[PDB]
Amino acid sequence: VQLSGEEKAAVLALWDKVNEEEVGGEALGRLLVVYPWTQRFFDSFGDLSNPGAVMGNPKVKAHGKKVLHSFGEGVHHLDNLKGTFAALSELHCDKLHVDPENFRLLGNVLVVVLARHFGKDFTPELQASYQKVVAGVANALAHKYH
Amino acid sequence: VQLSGEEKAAVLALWDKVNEEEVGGEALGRLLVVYPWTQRFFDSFGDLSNPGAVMGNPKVKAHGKKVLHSFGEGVHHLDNLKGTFAALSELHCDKLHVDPENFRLLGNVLVVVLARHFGKDFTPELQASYQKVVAGVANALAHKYH
Amino acid sequence: VLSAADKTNVKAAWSKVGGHAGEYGAEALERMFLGFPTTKTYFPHFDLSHGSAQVKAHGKKVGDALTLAVGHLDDLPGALSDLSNLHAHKLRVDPVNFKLLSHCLLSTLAVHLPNDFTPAVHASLDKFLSSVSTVLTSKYR
Amino acid sequence: VLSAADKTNVKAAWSKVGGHAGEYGAEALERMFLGFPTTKTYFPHFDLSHGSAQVKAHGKKVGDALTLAVGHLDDLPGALSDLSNLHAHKLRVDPVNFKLLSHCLLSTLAVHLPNDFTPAVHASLDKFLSSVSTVLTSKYR
Ligand code: HEM
Ligand code: HEM
Ligand code: HEM
Ligand code: HEM
Structure with missing residues (x-):
């Protein structure tokens, strides 16, 4: 979709410093705890009944890394x-049946985490750009849906 | 987006009978009354403070016809x-600043009205198809957004 | 969120629904399964074929619940608590799905009660169903 | 929708926000105007430049309101009624915009209180802000 070129440059320079594991x-953990209906899709992961057990769950940590890798x-x-994201859009829709509203929810939580990690370096103008990126990913995962 | 061919045929045969004015x-009237924050965008139309005055407002009737024409x-x-819808997506976004959530709201109300008018002829299977069409229009009006 | 007028509107509309609430419930389920495929997920144990006895029996339960709510409109939280625990805690239904069922409910009412489903009444019904949904997903908020 | 634990969580979090609620309010407004352009519409009479006195003064009013709500959490409907009339009836703010401001509020809190903005606290804050929004758009439902 784009957004600008001084902009793409600022987005790319932040990702340089993003620890995809962390x-x-x-x-992913934030997601499972704030929006708890998303837990339904991760039952194979075992214990997600409370904040300590989610954030500390090794499968959550591992799947999260995989998600942030594809974000990357x-x-x-x-x-x-x-x-x-075409392959992934088919996986999420045809196979797992995730309502696409949840892509938006995850992208927003992603933004909040980046904000937590980078502090005053994550400027309003920089969030602005990432809101675009996250919206882009979410629409691309909703697409070749049917 | 498509959806099928016995399907497109059923959708087209219903539109044959759709009175775009009515x-x-x-x-449009339904929209302004159920979701009342949408009234904000139609202030030039005058009195929309109550159900009788909306449904009977000539500008509402006329704009509605124009909307259902483009739907057509x-x-x-x-x-x-x-x-x-490209031209229209730019009008709604760059110029009027309508959040795209409202396109969905209008398409749904559209479906409810078709249901009211056609009764038992508007089958579950036929609504199914129109849900697709309406979602298609809504996504197309959200697009070449930026 | 429900004003006096809305309560009046809703009580009145449902009285016109009468003994059909069950039938409308089942049809609404159908229109949901067909129009919004993602919702078929919550019902694996169910025969979702197009005139099936489970959807019909399930349809009856939904109508029964909606009738109860109409007779409790001032304390929906109290009357629907069994139901809130079930949907939010056990089944962990995605809240978006309530919007979808609601739309299909209004679709059904429109089909069968075209003369009674006026703009005023549609608005009050939407408000009602938004309120039932909010209680049924309160273990979230 | 707000449980005891959530009320505890929210009261605690805001105490850490302290005298900064005003500053956070203004920053949150900024992040909204920049990230979600559609919202600039509600504020024509405003200088939306990036260190403007109106957003700052407006930011203070929002923080003041959120503080009030924290001290009224058991009767948010009563304490926020002036505010509900304004947003829903006069300004007719699209309800989606509350979600957007809320997100930006959480974004701000995360920036300035990274150690205190734990998962548990984030969840309670989200619930709180959903509840403020619901009251502020009740003249709708
Ligand atoms: C930013 C948006 C998202 C991205 C980029 C994303 C990406 C991915 C990727 C890459 C995989 C693994 C693909 C593979 O290697 O085969 C995956 C799996 C999965 N995702 Fe998503 N995802 C997103 C949002 C969501 C949401 C909102 C849900 C909620 C239902 C979800 C549920 C799942 C599930 C259940 C799996 C399967 C995990 C398993 O193996 O058990 N994802 N996702
Ligand atoms: C099905 C989705 C929609 C379609 C297909 C549609 C279509 C149109 C069309 C064709 C026009 C006139 C274009 C022209 O001839 O220049 C128009 C105007 C307009 N539409 Fe939309 N519209 C939709 C949804 C909405 C929504 C949700 C809003 C709520 C804000 C909205 C607000 C307006 C406004 C304010 C105008 C300008 C009317 C005027 O001249 O004052 N539309 N729309
Ligand atoms: C107006 C909104 C709704 C009402 C009033 C309602 C009411 C009910 C009631 C009374 C039951 C009892 C079923 C029983 O006793 O066997 C039930 C069950 C159930 N509902 Fe809902 N429901 C609503 C929306 C939804 C939605 C949106 C979903 C998900 C798409 C859903 C999924 C289920 C499931 C899976 C069951 C269990 C059925 C079974 O296992 O036998 N419901 N609902
Ligand atoms: C947490 C949610 C919100 C709270 C607590 C809140 C609170 C307030 C308060 C206390 C005022 C009083 C302003 C004054 O006295 O001058 C106000 C004004 C206003 N708010 Fe909100 N607000 C919220 C969300 C929003 C949203 C989402 C919008 C739209 C994007 C909005 C648009 C406005 C506008 C246009 C004014 C009038 C400002 C003026 O004309 O001076 N508010 N708000």
Whole structure:
């Protein structure tokens, strides 16, 4: 979708510093705890009944890393979001049946975590850009839906 | 987006019988009364403070017809939704600043009105198809957004 | 969120629904399963075929519940608590799905009660169903 | 929708926010205007530049309101009625915009209180802000 070029540059320079293990684990964890209906999709992961057990669950941490990794393939491929995520959009829709509203929820939590980790470096203007990216990923995962 | 061919045929045969003046007036009217924050965008139309004055407002009836007309250009152009509505997506976004959530709201009300008008002829299987069409239009009006 | 007028509107509308609440409940379920496929997920143990006895029996239970709520509108939280625990805690139903069922409910009412489903009444019904949904997902908020 | 634990969580979190509620309110407004352009619409009479005195003064009013709500959490409907009339009836704010401001509020809190913004606390804050929003858009439902 784009958004600008001084902009893409600021987004790329932040990702340089993103620890996908750490951010992804927390982001997925955040999701499971704030929005608890999303727990339904991760039953194979075992105990998710409380905040301590989610955040400390090794499968959560591992899946989170995998999610933030694909987010990363997104950030490095903003010209072709719809192509990068096609396979994944079919997986989430045809197979797992996740309502796409939840993609938005996860992208927002992602933004909150980046904000927590980077502090005053995560400027309003920088969040602005990431809101775009996250919206881009979410739409691309909703697509080749049917 | 498509959906099927016995399906497109059923959708097209219903539109044959859709009175765009009547359906469009009621659909727009329904919108303004159930979701009242949408009234904010139609202030130039005058009195919309109550159900009788909305449904009977000539500008509502006229704009509604215009909306259902473009919906119709959608129904006859399902292969190229994103192209049919491009100009309109820019108007609604860049100019009027309508959150795209409201496109969904209007498409749903549209479905309810078709249901009211056609009764037992508007089958579950036929609503199913129209839910697709309406979702298609809504996504196409959200697009070439930025 | 429910004003006096809305309560009046809802009580009145449902009286016109009468002994059909069950039938409407089942049809609404159908329209949901067909129009919004993602919702078929909550019902594996169910025969979702197009005139099935489970959806019909389930349809009856939903109508019964909605009738109860209409007769309790001032304390929906109290009357629907069994139901709130079930949907939010056991089944962990995605809250978006309530919007979807609600739309299908209004779709059904419109089909069968076209003369009674006026703009005023549609608005009050929407408000009602938003309120039932909010209670049924309160173990979330 | 607010349980005892949530009320405890919220009271505690806000105490850590202290005299900064005003500053956070203004920053949150900024992040909204920049990230979600559609919201700039409600504020024509405003200088939306990036260190403007109106957003700052407006930011203070929002923080003041949120503080009030924290001290009224058991009767939010009563304490926020002036505010509900304004947003829903005069300004007719699209309800989606409350979700957007809420997200930006959590974004701000996370930036400035990273150690205190734990998962448990984030969840309670989300619940709180959903509840403030619901009251502020009740003239809808
Ligand atoms: C930012 C949006 C999201 C991205 C980028 C994403 C990405 C992924 C990826 C890459 C996988 C593994 C694909 C593979 O290697 O085969 C996956 C699996 C999965 N995701 Fe998503 N996901 C997103 C949102 C969600 C949401 C909102 C849900 C909630 C239902 C969800 C539920 C799942 C589940 C259940 C799996 C399967 C995990 C398993 O193996 O058991 N995802 N996701
Ligand atoms: C099914 C989705 C919708 C379609 C297909 C649609 C279509 C249209 C069309 C064709 C026009 C006139 C374009 C022209 O001739 O220049 C228009 C105008 C307008 N629409 Fe939409 N619209 C939709 C949804 C909405 C929604 C949800 C809103 C709520 C904000 C909205 C607000 C407006 C406004 C304010 C105008 C300008 C009317 C005026 O001249 O004052 N529309 N729309
Ligand atoms: C107006 C909103 C709703 C009402 C009033 C309602 C009411 C009920 C009631 C009374 C039951 C009892 C079933 C029984 O005793 O066997 C039930 C069960 C159930 N409901 Fe809902 N429901 C609503 C929405 C939903 C939604 C949106 C979903 C998900 C798409 C859902 C999924 C289920 C499931 C899976 C069961 C269990 C059925 C079984 O296992 O036999 N419900 N509901
Ligand atoms: C936590 C949610 C919110 C709270 C607690 C809140 C609170 C307030 C308060 C206390 C005022 C009084 C302003 C004054 O006295 O001058 C106000 C004004 C206003 N608010 Fe909100 N608000 C919220 C969300 C929103 C949202 C989402 C919008 C729309 C994007 C909005 C738009 C406005 C506008 C336009 C004014 C009038 C400002 C003026 O004309 O001076 N508010 N709000």
